Amino acid sequence: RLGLSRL
Amino acid sequence: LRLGLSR
Amino acid sequence: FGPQPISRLEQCGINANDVKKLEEAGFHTVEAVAYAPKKELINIKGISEAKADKILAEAAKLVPMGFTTATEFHQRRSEIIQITTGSKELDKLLQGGIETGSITEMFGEFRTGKTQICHTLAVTCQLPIDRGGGEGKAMYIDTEGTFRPERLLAVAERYGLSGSDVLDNVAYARAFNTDHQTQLLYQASAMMVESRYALLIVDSATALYRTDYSGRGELSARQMHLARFLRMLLRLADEFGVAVVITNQVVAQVDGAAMFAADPKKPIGGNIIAHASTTRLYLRKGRGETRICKIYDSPCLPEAEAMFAINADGVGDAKD
Amino acid sequence: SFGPQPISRLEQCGINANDVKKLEEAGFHTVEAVAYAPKKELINIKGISEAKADKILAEAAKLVPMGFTTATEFHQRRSEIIQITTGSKELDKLLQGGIETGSITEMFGEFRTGKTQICHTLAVTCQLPIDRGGGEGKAMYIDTEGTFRPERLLAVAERYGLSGSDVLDNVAYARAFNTDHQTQLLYQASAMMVESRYALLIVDSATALYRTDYSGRGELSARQMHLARFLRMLLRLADEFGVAVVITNQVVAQVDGAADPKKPIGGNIIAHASTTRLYLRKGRGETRICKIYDSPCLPEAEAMFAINADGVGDAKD
Amino acid sequence: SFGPQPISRLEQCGINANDVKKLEEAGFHTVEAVAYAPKKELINIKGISEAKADKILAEAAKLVPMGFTTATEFHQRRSEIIQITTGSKELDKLLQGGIETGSITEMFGEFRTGKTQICHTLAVTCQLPIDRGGGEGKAMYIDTEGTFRPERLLAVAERYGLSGSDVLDNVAYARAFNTDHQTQLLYQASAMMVESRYALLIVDSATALYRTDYSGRGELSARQMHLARFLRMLLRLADEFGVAVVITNQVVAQVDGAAMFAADPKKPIGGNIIAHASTTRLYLRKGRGETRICKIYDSPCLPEAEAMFAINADGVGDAKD
Amino acid sequence: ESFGPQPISRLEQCGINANDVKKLEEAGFHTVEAVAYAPKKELINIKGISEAKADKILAEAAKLVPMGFTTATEFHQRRSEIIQITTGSKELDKLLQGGIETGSITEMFGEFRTGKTQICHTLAVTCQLPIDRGGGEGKAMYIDTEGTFRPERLLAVAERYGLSGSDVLDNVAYARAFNTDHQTQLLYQASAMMVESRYALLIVDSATALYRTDYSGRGELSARQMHLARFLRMLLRLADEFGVAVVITNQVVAQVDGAAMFAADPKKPIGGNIIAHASTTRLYLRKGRGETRICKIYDSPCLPEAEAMFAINADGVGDAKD
Amino acid sequence: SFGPQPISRLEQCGINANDVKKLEEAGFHTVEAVAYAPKKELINIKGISEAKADKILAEAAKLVPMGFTTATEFHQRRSEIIQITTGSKELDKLLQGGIETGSITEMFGEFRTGKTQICHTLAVTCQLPIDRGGGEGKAMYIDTEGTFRPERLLAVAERYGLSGSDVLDNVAYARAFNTDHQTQLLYQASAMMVESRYALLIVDSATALYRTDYSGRGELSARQMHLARFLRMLLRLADEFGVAVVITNQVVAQVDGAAMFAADPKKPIGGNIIAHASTTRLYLRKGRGETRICKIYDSPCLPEAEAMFAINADGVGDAKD
Amino acid sequence: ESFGPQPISRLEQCGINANDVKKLEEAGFHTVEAVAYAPKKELINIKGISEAKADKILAEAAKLVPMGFTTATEFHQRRSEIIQITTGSKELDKLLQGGIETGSITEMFGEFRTGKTQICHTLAVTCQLPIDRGGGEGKAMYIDTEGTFRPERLLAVAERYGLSGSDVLDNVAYARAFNTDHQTQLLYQASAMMVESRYALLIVDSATALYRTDYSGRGELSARQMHLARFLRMLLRLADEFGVAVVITNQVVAQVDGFAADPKKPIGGNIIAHASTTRLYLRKGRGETRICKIYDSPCLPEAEAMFAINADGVGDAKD
Amino acid sequence: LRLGLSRLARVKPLHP
Amino acid sequence: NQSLRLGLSRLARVKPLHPN
Amino acid sequence: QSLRLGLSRLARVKPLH
Amino acid sequence: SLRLGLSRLARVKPLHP
DNA sequence: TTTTTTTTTTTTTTTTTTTTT
Ligand SMILES: [Ca+2]
Ligand SMILES: [Ca+2]
Ligand SMILES: [Ca+2]
Ligand SMILES: [Ca+2]
Ligand SMILES: [Ca+2]
Ligand SMILES: [Ca+2]
Ligand SMILES: [Ca+2]
Ligand SMILES: [K+]
Ligand SMILES: [K+]
Ligand SMILES: [K+]
Ligand SMILES: [K+]
Ligand SMILES: [K+]
Ligand SMILES: [K+]
Ligand SMILES: [K+]
């Protein structure tokens, strides 16, 4: 994971 | 018999 | 999707006292332990070499620490949230807004509006995803004491949000020295592990470093402390996936070799903060209430300039 | 047969056939790897006797050539070496063909000079046909800053006329959070590289994490030692699979007021370990200047390139 | 009769052929090698007893003198030694003739100083006729960093008017991958040099592999002992075959001191073992542009002085205007 | 007069058969002092010699050599006229109160480029000078274990002192040692040549260089130390026999222990307690600035610890030029 | 009649002169020496039979005391023992008076620590009167290293206000070339003590020549027996003439890893024989500058403690502030 | 009661003339218990005995001394009333289960400075303590061969236990031996003098030191051993004639061949190994502490104890 | 001997 | 015999390695 | 006469100096 | 008479006349 | 079926900007 997910 | 110094 | 709590590792086969020691040390999350090397765990008194060895070797299993193809990375990064700055031109030049998971750093002289940008981002962070927000709470670590909870109300009124929930959704902390800054970062991680946060503002990052450390004798210590602080920020960004935003001041080139142009203004911090910062913005004063933002360093964004303004509702587009 | 011979050949002339798997667990996946290793490394492995290590070394030595040879054969072999085009004609002319394989090239400069841009351009161009200047193989990218953007790879691939999907599929990516993870990634790369054909290994950057992982002068010594070991491992790869190793470095300003006031970090260890060194400086606008800071055969000179929307290329006048 | 005596000379002295073969397989290829070795080495090898080792030593000593000679004879003999020109007139004047044969010369310095360029120039110039500064012999190159480049050799050969083909033909090359292979390279070189006339042996670099192979202060003693054994082998080779041994070294920065040595404190690595073992030491430093400075760190018959040379497209030479 | 040692042929007139004299000469006892100073075990070790023969030889040797008690005044008077060899430097001469003494052992140690070989060359040249000019009036012997003998320095010092270079080179004997066994065996030949001609100096450079690589590992330590002790005892026997001045060279090793603390000189001589106890005088050489070096008396039974400064000029070791 | 009686007194007891002369030629110069000698050693000299030796020992025991004695008399006699000042007040305080006669005191340590200096200081202070702490007698020096310097004696004599010529004339000196020569010098000493009064015996070093005379593990047994005989004879002399014997020693490094934990990885040579033979043991170590530390290692009446002395131009003294 | 030694003079009541009694006294027999515990070989070796008077004196000593079999109950009753001398250390006394046994040979060995002489001094001065405090209520004997006897330690320990120095130095007899023959003659004199008064201890320090240098080499070893044996037997005879406690000290040698952590062996051989009853091994610990181990004992199990040597003598560790 | 990737070597087209 | 040799004496008659 | 363990302190001898 | 070293007063033929 | 201890060694690793009249 790289950051907060848009989905 | 003798076995040592007598208490 | 969120970080796995350290309690998930309790049933994994270790003592609860070790978990308590890790929590009191500062490791509140499993991947926080995983990202740490053996040296940090060994430095913790009460943990033996075998204990740290098994802890790391078993914590590496849950988190992926191996090779992956670039296609998977591109697919994963295609769904990264970007927080709008409240200006259409700024969003256009940022190609979406402030990226989440990296370090964004604006710098400039006085009146540029770094604090205004920070306040606007802090308010906007709570917006829904479809409205440009990040759908999460925000915090403000202030070192200059220039936090006014009245601009936040104006920006909330612009977007049709009530003042009360916006105000209570924003955490505030003020630091008076670098050690307090580090403890504030530790406390920020502690509060992040039990809630949802999306933006962390550290205005200003190196404002206290000019005064706390003086002279050439303490230059190395100041630079290395700044490097440690930036590493802590980067670790927080990796672990929690929040967007970190800092702020720098400028100094004038008195060397006299800047005759090629007329702009003796370089950010302070030097190579450490130049390399650590993923994205850099340079702010310049324009006409009246309008300012200009230019990309300084960015791995993907080109070198372009945009024009914005600071109106009564916050940062927005300049009125023609 | 030209590539490395897998260690499975060792059980063809005679071996216990069980210690081979255990050497694979140790990290040696090639007869060249075990042959290049000293006896001390084999002894260090728990459960290997001195006689067993001696027999393994003797068996591996008889396969790989490790004797003397006339310099004319070395000249013939060097004339056949491959080089990868950087992306700009000027830099290729300065490097007399491009990036040499089997050696170590280090690029250093201040911020925004374009180390990562050149790294992406190389990672794309290494898949080009050999007649077009490519390395004809996949690429590996170890990133220690979270600064890997596939959009640049897509742009450069579109510029070169390839397909973006295959270009992305043919690049391996890893991220390291500390130095120990960097070494573990190197070991995993050594294990992986024997299956597929690779040509370029990129480290970006090699010494970013060493600045903060080890604190103060008291922990300096050990830190340097670790770095040395890391570099040695890289050399081993260049001696085994023939890939080109490219690493990036940061800079530090000289505070003592002596003598450009920027020097690469890592010290004499990385100064001696690197075979070629490139100093990058910011130019006017989107142009940058590259200087040959150290080379065993390339004369000291300078060249100019640029970072356009399709990666690193020739500057436009 | 000027060259070393082959081991077959021991056959006519009454020595068993099988023991001669065993000695040849043990690394002794000349009568001088047997004479210069103690009885312990002959005892250690399998198949030789105390009596036979004593007989071999006596027969070997009966062939090569090992006694006392007047200093005038030594002066007369040393007046006819061969010194190889390094390619620069200023460096030649500094070294009073060039690189001396039969002694260990070690050049150390920072990166890009020019050790490899000097090595390549010496390797090419060792093949020149005697009355031109050369030594009229082949050259060896033991490389531990993969920096050998025949292009520089071709350039220097072109500069000196020789032919590239035979210049490249008369150079032997080998690459070492660890310390043990570096050691056995000398064992192979002994036979390769008893086969044909050689003038110059290059080791570049001697200490680079030792740093990574032996790590920490736990393995310091073994590393130093191995380095001492390697240097002793080099000294034996130079004494027996009368060749010029040139080795290169690396440097480290002193975290302590600083004020003690204000000339950018940088000391050669290897320690007292390599400090004592080497006969001549040359400190290389960068000047301006392509010009470099060579200084005599240690020498038994040379005053401490500095000189300036340059690395031009045709090799190591004298700096121009 | 009768200052020189009595040759072994003196045993012929004392009732010892010529065959036994020849056997002793083969064994290395070229002087009456040598046989008189040896224990009965060494003579018994010689093949072809019986216990009675060894007893008679020892008694006859003891007849001609004094071996009893004497007052301290006689020893002081005898030591008053001893010959001290100048080092060429006034400061080093004053530090040692005359220079290197004859009949004893002097060992100098330090790091590289200190100047041990330079001092050895200067002493070798100056030992041929007349007595009134600080010399010893005798030849010089140079046992070399490193291949670092340079006649150019000898000629330079001879030119400085006004002597003839050809004669100076003619009056110096040179030998090279390739291993420890040869180094030990050279001393018998040294005695053989020193019996018939007067020698004032004997140089070993360096004594412990070969022992570092000849005996490698901790398991071979005992044999190495025993061989070194035997060599040092042989050197002492030579010094007490012919009255020559024995000078030996030593190396150094760094103290990785780290217990030196504020002491910024973590260098100790190699060789160990054997060479520490055996050596009489010890000098520590350190680098100063430029071409100047500092010598300190590490160990001496009659010389206090101090420091002196000396420069290696083009004419050898001498006084520094202010 | 405090001093030992001459063996000539045996003639008055009914012993012929030639028998006394034979006994003297055997090395006995005192009636106490005859009395303390065993029967087997009496038989082993030519000219003496079983009855003759028995009669000689009978009259010897007649002339000497060998019965039991109450401890009060022993205490009263021991309270009148004689001690010799070392030279430093701290050392005298540590030793409770200083060196004690009639016993064996050994000093051992590293090089340059000051064994020979202490021996010289003792040899000059032994001639001082009883009030000043001296021994009021001559001294002997046995030098097995060629390290006897009369200048130190002259300097200390000038420090104490004595006469240089007199202090030089009252010290005997002997150099030993081998162990057999050491024993012969001991015989000559035993002959000499009976005619002139002495108060100190110095050996330096007792075990210096034993290292090289007996080499290897093969000759350890004979070396140990020879050392035991030498120490027995020193004890015999001390018991006969009541002189303090002081022997120096040399140390070796404890190569075993167990000594790493210990702070003194150095042990005296000579082993159990010299460990048991010696009564008092002093361990000398170097302090700072020109000062040393002396520690009690083994003593029947002195606790473990350390002193602090120094070596100055006038010999052994106190550490000047 | 009939516990003290029975004087030889009462043999006059058994028809034995005074000349024979005087001759046996001159030989070295002073009690009837001694002659009874002596075969006819030495009796016939004496001048003036012609196999006629020897038989009758031996028969008289046999009827005057109990020599027949007895049940183990009386032996247990006699062993339960034995007197053990306190060593001054509680841990050492617990290790020895009471102290040093009387009527038996106790031998101690160890490296230098381990404290054999200190313990010997402590025992020699504490053997005079009252019977209720662990003493033996008797005098002490010190046969010294190395010349390391110091009354100062006796005075210090006497001050520790609260006695008089002059009154405690009067009850300790001392004698120095210069060779083995003198040592045996001192044993003879001790046996002669030990009937006049009451004794409890006899110390030989060290028993085997003069034998190291008196008999040197392989060619004279055997005789040496034989001599030693004789000496040891005499000691045992004393332990039966008067019941005193015999304490003898020993030196050590280093084993040069091939292992264990104790490369030290007691000099003396199997003769002294068998002759001695109880054996103690002394080792140097840390500072002033030493470790005592039981090497050989017929009843005491192997165990280790720690004891210190303070300025007041042998004592427990200063916690 | 091999010093790295050689141009004169058959390789399957990685990007056909 | 040629006594001792150290440095490839310059009077040695060696065939020319490079004839031209 | 009596045991002496060295030179007597009270012994009166002529001083050397 | 004992000898300790080379004698200054001894007559030695000079080597450099 | 007795007896006797011994011998030291090896160096190492760089760092960090500043401030306009
Ligand atoms: Ca602000
Ligand atoms: Ca980058
Ligand atoms: Ca190089
Ligand atoms: Ca030298
Ligand atoms: Ca001494
Ligand atoms: Ca004792
Ligand atoms: Ca039994
Ligand atoms: K402001
Ligand atoms: K950056
Ligand atoms: K380099
Ligand atoms: K040197
Ligand atoms: K000494
Ligand atoms: K003792
Ligand atoms: K027993």
Author numbering:
A (entry chain B): 333 to 339
B (entry chain L): 332 to 338
C (entry chain A): 20 to 339
D (entry chain C): 19 to 277, 282 to 339
E (entry chain E), G (entry chain I): 19 to 339
F (entry chain G): 18 to 339
H (entry chain K): 18 to 275, 279 to 339
I (entry chain D): 332 to 347
Cite, word for word, the article reporting this structure:
The central protein in HR is the RAD51 recombinase. RAD51 forms a nucleoprotein filament with single-stranded DNA (ssDNA) generated from enzymatic end resection at the DSB site. One emergent RAD51 modulator is RAD51AP1 (RAD51 associated protein 1), a protein that directly binds to RAD51 (15) and promotes its activities in HR, thus contributing to the maintenance of genome stability. Our studies reveal that RAD51AP1 acts as a RAD51 modulator via strengthening protomer–protomer interactions, promoting RAD51 oligomerization and reordering its DNA binding sites, thereby facilitating filament nucleation, stabilization, and strand exchange.
To understand how the two RAD51-binding sites of RAD51AP1 enhance RAD51 binding synergistically and how RAD51AP1 stabilizes RAD51-ssDNA filaments, we sought to determine the structure of RAD51AP1 in complex with RAD51-ssDNA filaments using cryoelectron microscopy. Consistent with its binding across multiple RAD51 molecules, RAD51AP1 binding tends to induce filament clustering and bundling, preventing structural studies using single particle analysis. We therefore first attached RAD51-ssDNA filaments stabilized by Ca2+ to a carbon surface on EM grids, then incubated the grids with RAD51AP1 before flash freezing the grids, which resulted in well-separated filaments suitable for single particle analysis. After selecting particles in which we observed extra density on the outside of the filament, we obtained a reconstruction of the filament at an overall resolution of 3.1 Å. The reconstruction has well resolved density for ssDNA bases, ATP bound in-between RAD51 monomers and side chains of RAD51, allowing us to build a structural model of RAD51-ssDNA filament. There is additional density on the surface of some of the RAD51 monomers that could correspond to RAD51AP1. Using AlphaFold3 (36) to model a complex between a RAD51 dimer and C59, we obtained a structural model that allowed the residues 329 to 349 of RAD51AP1 to be fitted into the extra density. The quality of density corresponding to RAD51AP1 is limited, probably due to the heterogeneity arising from the two RAD51-binding sites across two RAD51 monomers, and Site-N having a weaker affinity for RAD51. Interestingly, both in the structure of full-length RAD51AP1 in complex with Ca2+-ATP-RAD51-ssDNA and that of the C29-bound Mg2+-ATP-RAD51-ssDNA, we observe continuous density located N-terminal to Site-C.
